[PDB]
Design brief:
Number of strands of chain A: 0
Distance between the termini of chain A: 44 Å
Oligomer: homoheptamer
Strand content of chain A: under 5%
Largest interface: A-C, 21 and 17 residues
Number of helices of chain A: 1
Order of helices and strands of chain A: H
Largest sheet of chain A: none
Chain lengths: ~30, ~30, ~30, ~30, ~30, ~30, ~30
Amino acid sequence: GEIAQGIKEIAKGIKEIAWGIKEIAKGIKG
Amino acid sequence: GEIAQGIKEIAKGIKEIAWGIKEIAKGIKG
Amino acid sequence: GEIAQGIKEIAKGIKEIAWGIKEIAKGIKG
Amino acid sequence: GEIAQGIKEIAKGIKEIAWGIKEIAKGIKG
Amino acid sequence: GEIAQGIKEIAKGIKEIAWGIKEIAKGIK
Amino acid sequence: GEIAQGIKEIAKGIKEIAWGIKEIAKGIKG
Amino acid sequence: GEIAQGIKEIAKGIKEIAWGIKEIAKGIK
């Protein structure tokens, strides 16, 4: 259960990186 | 099943990062 | 236990990357 | 099989990130 | 034990990436 | 064996990201 | 053993990313 929870927290962090990269792409296009 | 679901969510986030990086590459090349 | 702890430490580092990427996006946006 | 498939999808997305990063390096060198 | 050690070495490297990214954000600012 | 192969494919893609990041560093330093 | 070896190769690649990101931060600075 602690392994499944760690993996889910990785997935959450990866989604937050994807959001940040999209914000960089928008900044560059500005 | 929760481990397989976490790994699939990581894969989804990584694909969204790939899309964002490609958008940055296109923005810079503009 | 050591595997679950290592995975949690990966998740912590990935969150720190997400914060850094957000700070880059803010810098680019001015 | 679902775990092996998720891991393979992570590998595919990571290779797509590598391609994008190489295109950023090309854009900067322009 | 070799798997746990490899995972811990990934964690260490990811933290060092985080520090570098923060330094980029400071450089841009 | 399918899990070991997926992990090795992730390792390959991570090395290709490392190469691209180094090419960015060289581009900027130019 | 093949799983432990793959994880160790990921750790090596992550450390090389960390080095590259540090070089970017130095370049911007």
